[PDB]
Design an enzyme around this catalytic site. Structure first.
Site: not given
Length: 395
Positions: A201, A352
């Protein structure tokens, strides 16, 4: 600039410590003790200086009463005992007489672990919204505070900003690297700086791009978010995901900062979203109408690697394709290897997804810094002043 634990007079002091014990569970069984392993040096150091340790952490997300039982910190206290080969005292309350009495009974070197700070969220979200009373109450249980939890540094909680307002506050050794390296990027970088951005995104990365564009010499873009940029350049992208509402942002970024922006030059496409799909490798100008860009090509891996040469800092944030699929993982593997291979450059992982990929690939030791705080590290890169950091004392 920031006060560190090794700047404090700890001996005989009751030391409150915010540690990141948010470890993966399964039936209330620790599946990954790595956040505990990493918390160790701050604790072991405070033990050596004759401090009395009182530990605070959150664990999971506590929304309602039935969430409590699988999110007790008892299993962490037990594991921490093995690691420390010394018994940690666990109190299964977040306040009260028994907690208070056990804290008072602590002698130098003793370690106590307070129950999940997010038990306080059930009545009024007090931990997560930094209730004034809770922070002050927790702070009143000790003499000094050490925040070693970078992972919640981007948020304002009782367990960080709350305690910090009532007590002299220092960074732990872990918090301190994140400030040094991630803060270093934004405050006083080792130039030239190269940023590699990935993931699905554009959205997610817009704010980091706006901040990094005046710091970095190059912004390298891959992953699913790259296809929007390609479209912005007039290329067909097939059925690759497109954020149409981010085309103007892309077009204007390219106009203001042209060659600074480095995009993929080939891509691995497929008709279906599956590791078993027929893949074809095409130039960026020949993406088929019915196909989806699922990994960067081998020429791009090469190009991206070449674009690192001469950088003294590289910041990586995001996989280069659909890393979850074996046959669409090569782009991320290749870029990961290039960054770990790069000599004489500080290499930083934020995010992450990138941290896990590198770690599972064998690369944890080959990066200057792999951040422990997914959301926090990105906000820090975006140029936000994290509340947990603001509240640590300067030196």
């Amino acid at each position: 600039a920031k006060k560190i634990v090794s700047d404090l007079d700890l001996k005989g002091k009751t030391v409150l410590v915010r540690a990141d014990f948010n470890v993966p569970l399964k039936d209330g069984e620790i599946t990954n003790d790595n956040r505990i392993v990493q918390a160790l040096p701050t604790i072991q150091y405070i033990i050596e200086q004759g401090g009395k340790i009182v530990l605070f952490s959150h664990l999971g997300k506590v929304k309602e009463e039935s969430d409590k039982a699988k999110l007790t910190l008892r299993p962490v206290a037990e594991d921490l005992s093995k690691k420390l080969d010394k018994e940690v005292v666990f109190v299964p309350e977040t306040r009260g007489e028994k907690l208070e009495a056990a804290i008072k009974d602590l002698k130098e070197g003793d370690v106590l672990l307070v129950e999940n700070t997010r038990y306080e969220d059930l009545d009024g979200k007090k931990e997560s919204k930094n209730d004034p009373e809770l922070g002050k109450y927790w702070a009143s249980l000790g003499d000094v505070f050490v925040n070693d939890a970078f992972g919640t540094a981007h948020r304002e909680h009782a367990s960080n900003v709350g305690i910090s307002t009532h007590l002299e506050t220092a960074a732990g050794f872990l918090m301190d690297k994140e400030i040094k390296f991630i803060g270093g990027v934004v405050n006083d970088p080792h130039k030239p700086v190269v940023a590699i951005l990935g993931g699905a995104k554009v959205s997610d990365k817009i704010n980091v791009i706006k901040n990094l564009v005046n710091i970095a010499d190059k912004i390298i873009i891959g992953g699913g978010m790259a296809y929007t940029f390609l479209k912005a350049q007039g290329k067909e992208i097939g059925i690759s995901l497109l954020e149409e509402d981010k085309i103007d942002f892309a077009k204007d970024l390219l106009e203001k900062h042209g060659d600074k922006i480095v995009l993929p030059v080939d891509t691995k496409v497929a008709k279906e979203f599956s590791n078993d799909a027929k893949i074809t490798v095409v130039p960026s100008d020949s993406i088929p109408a019915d196909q989806e860009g699922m990994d960067i090509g081998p020429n791009t891996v090469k190009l991206f690697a070449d674009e690192l040469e001469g950088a003294h800092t590289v910041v990586w944030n995001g996989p280069m394709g659909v890393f979850e699929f074996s046959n669409f993982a090569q782009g991320t593997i290749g870029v990961c290897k290039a960054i770990a291979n790069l000599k004489d450059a500080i290499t930083i992982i934020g995010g992450g997804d990138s941290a896990a990929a590198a770690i599972s690939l064998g690369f944890e030791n080959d990066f200057t810094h792999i951040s422990t705080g997914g959301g926090a590290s990105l906000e820090y890169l975006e140029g936000k002043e994290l509340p947990g950091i603001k509240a640590i004392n300067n030196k």
